[PDB]
Design a protein around this nucleic acid. Structure first.
Ligand code: ZN
Lengths: 50, 41, 52, 129, 236, 117, 67, 40
RNA sequence: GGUUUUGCGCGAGUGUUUGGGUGUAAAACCCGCACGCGUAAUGAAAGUGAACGUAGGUGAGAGCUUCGGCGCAUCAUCGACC
């Protein structure tokens, strides 16, 4: 799909359209997302020890 | 305003038309071969 | 949205990856005129009748 | 086998396609490509631009080079000939150097539409160990 | 150059905008001086927008009459640019054949049938103009039924480059299945009139030469089925 | 090499973001006091010593007394206008002298100097 | 991407799934013809879909989804 | 000491040939129909 | 800290996270220079340094084929060079 429609503050389209970036056509890889999100959730952690 | 048949379904119908005719022709050849096989044994 | 094309062109060491498949619709791959023209006849059906 | 070892959802897409093609076509090209999809990454060594040129330099020109592996660039190959390569993956240097020579880059699903029986294809793989 | 302020409205998500964009494209082809200056780049922008016009079409009845409207654009053009118009459509279809989904493929297969039907109907006034049959058949010999696997757009010079387009086998197979009944619709299959067998013959030799010279097993089987149709004058 | 008591001399770095923000607030507090002034001082272009690093230059410690004199910058005013001085370094070559004098004239062109009181 | 959606839906997470221990899985999505989660009846993973629903006033409608 | 000299010259030359590689491969990196510009 | 295998990312390169920039503030995002490992080997050393044959011939060999022949990886042998 080439373009997307812009909606104003009233929820109605304003007639302006913009092209979609190529990042929206990237591959969807749930293994890469799971591999990174598993590790990214660790980097917020705070050490504990007895 | 008559909704035309999809072109993908037209060429699927044509292959199914050929496949049904081939099966019907092979069934008649199988039936004649079975009759001759019966008289042999 | 206009910025989104720019920020992915400015990350060094990274290009937008190329997918290993071009068309991700399997039904367009298999139920196509190119593949179905060269296929054999089916050897059987989804339901197989019990002979004995 | 029974299940691909890869976690790539598009590699499972290709296994689904080539399972159908290996079952419903007499061509052993589809059976060989399906076997090499199930193989691990070490058992699919990378194939260089220099290696696909030598297997092209004979009368095997004008054939679709098929390498079910990644394609890497060789810096020692000064000039790249015109060539159509279908592979799993291409590096940025390799992809640019086929396109600079006037060649074309295909994926394996684009191969299945064009040459489903594997007609006029040169199948290659890289050096083991 | 030319001003083309309506292509971006062809791909809009609103049907009223797409209908208004089609009308501006209709009037743009009616401009006789502009359409006399139509070159191969602007018809490629035009058909790219018209491809997305059909790519945004919603239901079956709006799809069928949109396919009729895009085939009806062949008459609004002047005579000298019908070839370059029809070159641009087959270039767009070749370029964007693989990346159509299944549910959108049916209306695009209808568009090839309608454009091929309108092209064959444009052959009429010998009851067929020999100059007009030559361009529509030579284009049949270059995009769908080519002995070559690639088509070069534009020439090589210091003022520009070239565009290389590979011909998908699916377009070859689709035109093979629909060429028999399209010449049936215009009336080429009547055995009485002297000219009619000549166009039917030299179409059929150009696909027989495709059956002998090709290397794809799909085309060799399907060209034999197209020649083996029971409506052809040879097999009758 | 776990022959000694490694457990009683192990240092962990959970304060690495904490030291980073402390470091940025030290640079912030340095420019709070020296508000129009920059946060650093001028350092000369210096050639790395060994044959492994002959072909790369870096920032040194301070300018030669001959480098201040050729650029017209006085030696007892140079530390007050943000130029580091090093009396240990010598030129030994015209290329090291010409590169650093040109650096001092470029600093002189970009400089805004304010009149005392 | 209709198949790629289905692989994410079937094997990672779907907010409409109800996994029972009785050898069958259920779809809680209101636009599904059968309550079961399979490839045929998942409306999210089928771009073309149909569903029959009943209104509070008593009217029965047919719903159509296109690509 | 001529042995120790060429050992120092050996690892200097390996380092220098490594950096010329990085420059050469960086130089290798240097050598109207699109949707983004048509629909803009 | 080593080692084997599976997946993944990039690929003759790879590794942001010492540090700097930044922030909705121990998160996330960005990277200027070096550095580690790899990308040519051998000899104790001086040091030297990868083409005579489509980087070679022959025979197998997956796959392709205009049915004439092309021939992946790999192996055997005869070679070629350092
Ligand atoms: Zn579901």
């Amino acid at each position: 799909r080439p373009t997307v429609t812009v909606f104003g503050a009233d929820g109605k389209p304003t007639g302006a359209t913009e092209v979609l970036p190529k990042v929206f056509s990237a591959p969807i890889r749930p293994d890469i997302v799971k591999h990174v999100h598993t590790g990214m959730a660790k980097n917020k952690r705070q050490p504990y020890a007895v | 305003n008559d909704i035309l048949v999809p072109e993908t379904l037209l060429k699927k119908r044509k292959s199914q038309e050929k496949a049904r005719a081939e099966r019907a022709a092979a069934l008649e050849k199988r039936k004649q071969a079975n009759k001759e096989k019966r008289q042999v044994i | 949205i206009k910025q989104l094309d720019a920020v992915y062109e400015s990350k060094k060491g990274f290009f937008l990856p190329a997918n290993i498949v071009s068309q991700a619709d399997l039904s367009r791959l298999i139920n196509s005129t190119e593949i179905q023209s060269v296929l054999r006849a089916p050897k059987g059906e989804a339901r197989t009748k019990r002979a004995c | 086998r029974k299940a691909p070892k890869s976690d790539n959802v598009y590699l499972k897409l290709l296994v689904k396609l080539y399972r159908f093609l290996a079952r419903r076509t007499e061509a052993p090209f589809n059976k060989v490509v399906l076997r090499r999809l199930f193989m691990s990454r070490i058992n699919r060594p990378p194939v260089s631009l220099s290696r696909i040129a030598r297997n092209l330099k004979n009368g095997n020109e004008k054939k679709t080079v098929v390498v079910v592996a990644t394609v890497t660039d060789d810096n020692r190959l000064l000039q790249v000939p015109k060539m159509e390569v279908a592979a799993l993956r291409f590096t940025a240097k390799a992809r640019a150097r086929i396109e600079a020579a006037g060649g074309r880059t295909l994926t394996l699903d684009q191969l299945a539409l064009e040459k489903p029986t594997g007609a006029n294809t040169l199948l290659l793989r890289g050096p083991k160990n | 150059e030319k001003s083309m302020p309506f292509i971006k409205h062809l791909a809009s998500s609103d049907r009223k905008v797409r209908t208004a964009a089609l009308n501006s494209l209709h009037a743009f082809l009616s401009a006789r001086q502009v359409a006399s200056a139509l070159t191969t780049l602007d018809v490629l922008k035009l058909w790219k927008g018209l491809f997305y016009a059909l790519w945004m079409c919603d239901r079956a009845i709006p799809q069928q009459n949109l396919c009729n409207e895009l085939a009806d654009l062949i008459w609004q053009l002047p005579r000298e640019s019908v070839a370059t118009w029809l070159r641009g459509f087959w270039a767009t279809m070749a370029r964007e054949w693989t990346g159509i989904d299944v549910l959108r493929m049916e209306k695009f297969l209808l568009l090839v049938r309608r454009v091929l039907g309108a092209s064959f109907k444009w052959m009429k006034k010998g009851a067929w103009d020999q100059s007009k049959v030559d361009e529509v058949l030579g284009l049949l010999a270059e995009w769908p039924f080519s002995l070559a696997e690639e088509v070069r757009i534009t020439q090589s010079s210091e003022k520009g480059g070239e565009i290389v387009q590979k011909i998908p086998v699916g377009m070859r197979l689709h035109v093979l299945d629909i060429w028999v009944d399209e010449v049936e619709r215009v009336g080429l299959l009547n055995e009485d009139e002297e000219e009619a067998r000549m166009i039917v013959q030299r179409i059929s030799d150009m696909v027989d030469a495709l059956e002998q010279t090709t290397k794809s097993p799909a085309v060799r089987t399907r060209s034999k089925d197209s020649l083996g149709d029971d409506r052809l004058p040879a097999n009758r | 090499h776990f022959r000694k008591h490694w457990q009683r001399r192990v240092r962990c770095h959970f304060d690495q973001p904490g030291k980073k923000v402390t470091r940025r607030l030290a640079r912030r507090a340095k420019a709070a006091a020296l508000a129009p002034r920059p946060v650093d001082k001028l350092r000369p272009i210096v050639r790395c010593p060994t044959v492994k690093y002959n072909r790369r230059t870096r920032l040194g410690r301070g300018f030669t007394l001959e480098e201040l004199k050729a650029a017209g910058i006085p030696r007892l005013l140079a530390p007050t206008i943000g130029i580091a001085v090093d009396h240990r370094r010598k030129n030994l070559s015209e290329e090291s002298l010409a590169a650093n004098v040109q650096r001092l004239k470029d600093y002189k062109a970009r400089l805004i100097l304010f009149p005392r009181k | 991407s209709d198949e790629i959606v289905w692989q994410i839906i079937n094997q990672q997470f779907c907010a409409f799934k109800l996994k029972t221990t009785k050898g069958q899985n259920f779809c809680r999505n209101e636009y599904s013809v059968s309550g079961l989660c399979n490839r045929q009846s998942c409306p999210l993973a089928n771009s073309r879909y149909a569903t029959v629903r009943q209104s509070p006033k008593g009217t029965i409608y047919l719903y159509i989804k296109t690509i | 000491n001529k042995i120790r000299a060429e050992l120092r010259k050996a690892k200097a030359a390996r380092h220098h040939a490594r950096m010329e590689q990085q420059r050469d491969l960086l130089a290798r990196k240097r050598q109207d129909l699109d949707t983004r510009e048509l629909f803009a």
